[PDB]
């Protein structure tokens, strides 16, 4: 979290917390209500975001779900939607934490090696997260959509 980063940056140079870190933590605390609202509407609409974004992904990229594809079959399609729900949950965790380090520590270290072992196209996973970004950004106000799309675009950058 932002609190974790500020405490770590103070402790690395072995001092108490600077006024800049206090101002940053104060901004984190004041934006906590809006961040909690964004996380609340994401976890409330968690099923329809995954459903609509998976539908848009499978319409835009039929090759991953056609026979010979990585996600062909109902079980592999359900596993792909489970992965999309996993990344939406990590997006909600990042929205709560105010930064990107829970998404990084849980689902973005070794993601390329994992999906290379799985045989899954990582650019198609990034397309799935981009469709989740578009569907979720259509479900909020403009500032909330930009704030959530920041974490979404971090996941896009880590996947591609």
């Amino acid at each position: 979290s932002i609190v974790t980063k500020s405490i770590v940056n103070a402790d690395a140079e072995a001092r108490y917390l600077s006024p800049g870190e206090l101002d940053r933590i104060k901004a984190f605390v004041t934006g906590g209500a809006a961040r909690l609202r964004i996380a609340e509407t994401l976890t409330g609409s968690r099923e329809t975001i995954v459903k609509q974004a998976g539908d848009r992904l499978f319409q835009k990229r039929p090759d991953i779900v056609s026979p010979g594809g990585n996600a062909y079959g109902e079980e592999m399609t359900a596993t792909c939607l489970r992965d999309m729900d996993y990344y939406l949950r990590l997006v909600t965790y990042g929205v709560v934490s105010g930064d990107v380090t829970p998404i990084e520590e849980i689902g973005l270290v070794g993601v390329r090696e994992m999906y290379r072992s799985l045989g899954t196209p990582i650019e198609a996973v990034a397309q799935s997260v981009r469709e989740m970004k578009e569907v979720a950004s259509g479900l909020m106000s403009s500032d909330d959509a930009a704030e959530a799309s920041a974490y979404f675009d971090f996941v896009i950058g880590k996947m591609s």
Binding site: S1, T4, T43, Y93, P102
Partner: protein
């Protein structure tokens, strides 16, 4: 290193759960307590040298054998090392007050503290007595100042005494 937000996220990640209303209530309580935590940390930012000096000036009168010969705070080298240790404890207590979670204390203070103190002959009882002296001073200063919430101040020091202290009963 984990704060309250990070440990709640880890606890929900372990079960693979989305954040429910109880998690929203915990984060909401942390966010409204955060202003008081910031105020308390900014208070102890100013006074920290005076806190550790008066903590030494109370601890070495409660246990005066520390400054007598064969005590571990005898020479001024050992005295300055003890005051540096008290400054370390107050700095990480400030960190735990900001983070609202004692995982920072566990990871960066307590995991080798008995090992170092038993290696160098440093007592643990006078150390945790100094911890509680610092806790009483910060609680009294917060009660004197305009602090609406003072309940969270005693938590990192009590956690440090419980973790570091030898199990009596």
């Amino acid at each position: 290193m984990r704060d309250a937000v990070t440990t709640l996220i880890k606890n929900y990640d372990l079960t693979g759960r989305y954040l429910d209303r109880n998690a929203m209530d915990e984060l909401k309580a942390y966010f409204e307590s955060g202003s008081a935590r910031i105020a308390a940390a900014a208070m102890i930012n100013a006074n920290s040298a005076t806190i550790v000096k008066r903590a030494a000036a109370q601890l070495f009168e409660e246990i005066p054998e520390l400054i007598r010969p064969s005590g571990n705070a005898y020479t001024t080298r050992r005295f300055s090392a003890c005051l540096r240790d008290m400054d370390y404890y107050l700095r990480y207590a400030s960190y735990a007050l900001i983070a609202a979670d004692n995982n920072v204390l566990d990871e960066r203070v307590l995991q080798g503290l008995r090992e170092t103190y038993n290696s160098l002959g440093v007592p643990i009882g006078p150390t945790v007595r100094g911890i509680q002296i610092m806790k009483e001073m910060i609680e009294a200063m917060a009660e004197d100042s305009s602090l609406n919430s003072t309940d969270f101040i005693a938590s990192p020091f009590d956690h440090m005494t419980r973790e570091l202290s030898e199990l009596s009963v």
